[model samples]
Target: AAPCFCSGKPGRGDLWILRGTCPGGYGYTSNCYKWPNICCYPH
Candidate 1:
C-alpha cells in the first residue's frame, strides 16, 4: 500500500518495468518506452 509520487518510477519495480515520468508526474514507465515514451534515469 505505497502511495505513488511525482518521484519517477523505477523500471525495476513490478509495474514501472523501466522508469520515467507520468502525466501529472506521478507514475513510472519503461525504458524502451514508445509514444508517450518512458525512459531511464538522467533521461
Candidate 2:
C-alpha cells in the first residue's frame, strides 16, 4: 500500500498528507509524495 496525501486546498497546514494507504484515483508512486511539493501540504 502507498501513502495518502491531503487535498491541494490552502490553509490545511504542512502535515496534511498521512503515511498510509493511498485512496482511489490517486497514484501511489507518483511525484505527489515529494517533500515541499505543491498540492500536498503547506499550501
| Highest-lDDT candidate | 2
Model 2, residue 41: what's the lDDT? 30
Q: Model 1: residues >4 Å from true position, as ranges? A: 1-30, 41-43
Candidate 2 residue 40 Cα shift, in angstroms, is 8.1
Lowest summed lDDT window (length 10), candidate 1: 10-19
Q: Each model's TM-score, in the order given?
A: 0.15, 0.15
lDDT of 2 by residue, 1-43 (tens): 1234445532443332344323434432322343443233323
What is the clash count of model 2?
0
* lDDT values for all models: 0.33, 0.36
